[PDB]
Amino acid sequence: LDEYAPEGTEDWSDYDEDFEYDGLTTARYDDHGFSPEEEERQLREFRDMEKEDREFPDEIELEPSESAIERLKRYRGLKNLYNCDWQVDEKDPSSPAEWKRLLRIGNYKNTKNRIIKETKNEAQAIAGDRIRMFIRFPKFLLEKIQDPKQLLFAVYGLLLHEHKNAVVNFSLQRWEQYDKPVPSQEPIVVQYGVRRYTIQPLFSQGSNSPNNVHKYERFLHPDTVSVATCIAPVDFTQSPAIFFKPSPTDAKNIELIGHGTFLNADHSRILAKRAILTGHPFRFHKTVVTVRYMFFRPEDVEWFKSIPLFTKSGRSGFIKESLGTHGYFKATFDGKLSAQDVVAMSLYKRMWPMPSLPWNG
Numbered sequence: 001l002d003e004y005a006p007e008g009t010e011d012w013s014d015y016d017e018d019f020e021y022d023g024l025t026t027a028r029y030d031d032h033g034f035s036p037e038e039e040e041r042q043l044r045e046f047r048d049m050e051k052e053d054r055e056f057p058d059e060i061e062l063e064p065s066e067s068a069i070e071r072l073k074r075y076r077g078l079k080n081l082y083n084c085d086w087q088v089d090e091k092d093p094s095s096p097a098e099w100k101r102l103l104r105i106g107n108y109k110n111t112k113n114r115i116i117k118e119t120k121n122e123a124q125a126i127a128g129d130r131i132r133m134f135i136r137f138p139k140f141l142l143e144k145i146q147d148p149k150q151l152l153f154a155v156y157g158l159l160l161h162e163h164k165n166a167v168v169n170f171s172l173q174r175w176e177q178y179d180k181p182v183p184s185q186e187p188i189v190v191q192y193g194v195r196r197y198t199i200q201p202l203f204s205q206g207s208n209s210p211n212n213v214h215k216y217e218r219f220l221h222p223d224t225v226s227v228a229t230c231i232a233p234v235d236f237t238q239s240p241a242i243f244f245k246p247s248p249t250d251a252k253n254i255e256l257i258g259h260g261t262f263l264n265a266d267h268s269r270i271l272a273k274r275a276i277l278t279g280h281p282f283r284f285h286k287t288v289v290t291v292r293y294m295f296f297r298p299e300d301v302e303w304f305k306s307i308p309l310f311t312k313s314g315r316s317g318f319i320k321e322s323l324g325t326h327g328y329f330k331a332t333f334d335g336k337l338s339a340q341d342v343v344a345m346s347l348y349k350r351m352w353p354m355p356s357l358p359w360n361g
Contacts, residue, residue, distance in 0.1 A: 001163065002163065002164070003163060003164065003165050003233070004098055004101035004102070004164070004165070005101065005103055005161070005164040006101075007103075008101050008102055008103045008104065008164060009100055009101055011104055012089070012100065012104060014089075015089070015091070016087065016089045017087060017089065017090060017091070018091060019090075021073055021074050022073070024073075026302070026303050026304075026305065026306060027072070027075065027076075027077050027303060027304055027306065027307060028075075028076055028077070029076075029077045029078065029306040029307055031078070031084065031085075032078070032079055032084075033077075033306030033307075034305065034306045043181070046181040046183065047181055049181075049218075049219075050181045050219050053218055053219055057274075057276060058274045058275055058276040059276050059277075059278050060275055060276070060277060060278075061278070062277065062294070062295065062296070064296045065296075067296075067297060067299075067300065068277075068295060068300050068303075068304075069299070069300065069303055072275075072304075072347065074092075074349070075275065075347040075348065075349055076347065076348040076349065076350070077304070077306065077307035077308075077345075077346070077347055077348070078348060079308055081209065081211075081213060081215075081272060081348070082209050082210055082211065083210070084211070085211065086211040086212075086213045086270070088267060088268050088270055090350055092350060092352075094350070094351070094352055095352050096231075096352060096353075096354065096355060098231075098355055099231075099352065099353075102164075102165060102166050102167065102231065102267070103161060103164040103165070103166050104166070104267050105166055105234065105265045105266070105267065108264050108265040108266060111236075112236045112237075112238070115159050115160055115236050116236070116237075118160070119157075119159060133155065156193070156194050159236045162233055162234055162235070162236065163233060164233070165231055165232055165233045165234070165355070165356075166231070166232075166233075166234050166265050166267065167229065167230075167231055167265065167266060167267040167269065167353050168228075168229070168230050168231065168232040168234060168262065168264075168265060168353075169227055169228065169229055169262075169263045169264040169265070169266060169269050170190070170192075170201060170227070170228040170230070170241050170260055170261070170262050170263060171206070171225055171226075171227065171228070171241075171260030171261050171262075171263050172201070172203070172220060172225060172226040172227065172228050172243070172258050172260050173225050173258055173259050173260050174220065174222070174257075174258045175256045175257060175258050175259065178256070178257070178258070179222075180255075180257065181219065182219065182220050182257055182258075183203075183218060183219055184200070184201065184202040184203040184216070184217065184218060184219070185200050185202070185354075186200065187199070187200050188200070188201065188243050188244070188245060188257055189243075189244055189245060189246060189359045190232075190241055190242070190243050190244075190356075191241065191242040191244070192235055192239050192240070192241040192242075192262055193235045193237065193239040195233070195235075195358065196358065196359040196360070197232055197233075197356050197357065197358050197359055198356060198357045198358070198359045199228075199230050199232055199356040200230065200354050200356065201228030201229065201230045201243075202216060202217075202228065202229045202230065202271055202351070202353060202354070203216070203217035203218070203219060203220055203221075203226050203227075203228060204216055204217050204226065204227050204228075204229060204269075204271055205217060205221065205224065205226060205227065206225065206226070206227035206263070212266070212268040212269055212270075213269075213270055213271075213272055214227070214269070214271065214272070215271075215272055215274060216271035216272055216273045216274070216351050220258070225260070227263065227269075228260075229269055229270075229271060229353045230353050230354060230356055231353045231354060231355045231356055232356045234262075234265045235262055238261055238262050239261070239262065240259065240260070240261050241259070241260050241261060241262055242256070242259055243256070243257045243258045243259065243260070244256050244257060245257060270350060270351065270352065270353075271350075271351040271352075271353075272348045272349065272350070272351065273348070273349035273350075273351040274346065274347070274348055274349075275345075275346075275347040275348070275349070276344050276345065276346055276347075277294060277344060277345035277347070278293075278294075278342055278343075278344055279291055279292070279293055279294040279342065279343045279344065279345075280292055280293050280339075280342065280343075281337060281339060281341065281343055282328065284336075284337065284338070284339075287332065288320060288330050288331070288332060289317075289330070289331050289332075289333055289337060290323055290328055290329070290330050290331075291328065291329060291330075291331055291343055292326075292327065292328050293327055294327045294329070294343075294345070295327040296325075296326060296327045297325065297327075298322045298324070298325050300327070301319070301322040301327075301329050302322060304319075304345065305319050307345055307346070307347070308346070309331055309333075309343055309344070309345065310343070310344055310346055311333075311337060311341050311342065311343050311344065312341070312342055312344065313337070313341050315333060315334060315335050315337055315341070316333075316334060317331050317332055317333030317334060318331065318332055319331050319332075320332050331343075
C-alpha cells in the first residue's frame with residue numbers, strides 16, 4: 001500500500017554514466033566533434049508565448065553582458081536526434097528523486113495480456129454475484145459518505161502493482177471547437193479508468209524514433225494528436241482518458257481540454273528540450289561567410305566550435321575561425337546563402353517526467 005514501492009529501488013542500482021559538466025573545455029560534443037486580473041494577464045501572456053512558439057519555435061535572444069557559457073554548460077550539441085546513442089540512466093539535478101522509486105515496466109502489451117489472463121483465471125469470485133464486502137476504511141472519511149439510496153456508490157477492481165506508479169504515455173486529441181492555451185506543465189485533472197489525478201503531462205509528438213527520444217513540445221499541437229509523458233499509476237486496460245479542468249465560474253464544473261487513451265507504460269520515453277540560437281549572416285565571400293550577432297565574446301566561439309550550424313532554408317555548415325570580439329565569426333557552408341536567411345545553433349537538454357497526485361471532489 002504505497003505509491004513508491006520498495007522493490008522498485010534495487011532493480012536500477014547499476015550506475016552507468018556519471019559524466020560531469022564542470023571539467024570541460026568546450027561543450028559536450030566529444031562523441032562526434034573535436035485574482036481574476038492575474039489570471040487574465042497570465043492567459044494573455046500564455047497566448048503570446050503560444051503564438052511566439054508558432055512562428056519562432058525555440059528561439060532565445062542573447063544579452064551582450066551575459067555570457068552564454070554559464071547558461072549553456074549543461075546542454076548537449078549532438079548533430080542528429082534519431083542516430084546518436086541516447087540513454088535513460090543519466091544522473092542530473094533536474095531528475096526527480098522519486099524516479100528512483102518507480103516500477104520500471106519493460107514491456108507493456110505482453111504483461112498487460114498476462115495480467116488480463118491472471119484476472120480471468122485467478123478471480124475466485126465469479127462475475128455477476130451478490131457479495132458482502134468487509135473492507136478496512138478510515139474513521140474520518142465516514143463523514144463524507146452519504147446514504148446509498150440517493151447516491152450511486154460503485155466499486156472498481158484493480159490489477160497487480162497498479163498502486164505503484166510508473167512512467168506513463170497518453171494520447172492527446174483536442175476537444176472540438178476548443179483553443180485554450182495548455183502548456184506541458186499546468187495541472188490538468190485526468191480521469192482514466194475511473195480514477196482522477198492532477199497530472200502535469202509533458203507534451204510531445206508520437207513519431208517513432210530509433211532511440212525512443214522525441215521533441216519536447218512546449219504546447220499542444222493544434223492539428224495532430226500529441227503524446228503526453230508523465231508519472232502516474234498505470235492502468236492495464238488502456239481505458240480512455242478524459243482531460244479536463246474544473247471551473248467554478250462555468251455552469252459545469254468541468255472544462256474539457258481534450259481526450260485520448262493511455263498509450264504506453266514505458267520508462268525509456270524521455271524528452272529533448274531544444275534550444276535554437278539565432279543569427280544574421282553579415283557578409284558573404286564565395287567560400288567563407290562572416291556572420292554577426294550570435295555571441296558577444298570570442299571564448300563563446302571557441303567553446304561552441306564543434307556544434308553544427310544550420311539554416312532554416314535547409315543549409316548546414318561548420319565554423320572556420322573567430323573573426324572578432326563582438327560575436328562575428330567566419331564559417332564554411334555547402335551552398336550559396338543570401339542575407340535574407342537566418343543561421344542558428346541547435347542545442348538539446350535531457351528532460352524528465354514529473355510525478356502526479358490524485359484528484360478528489
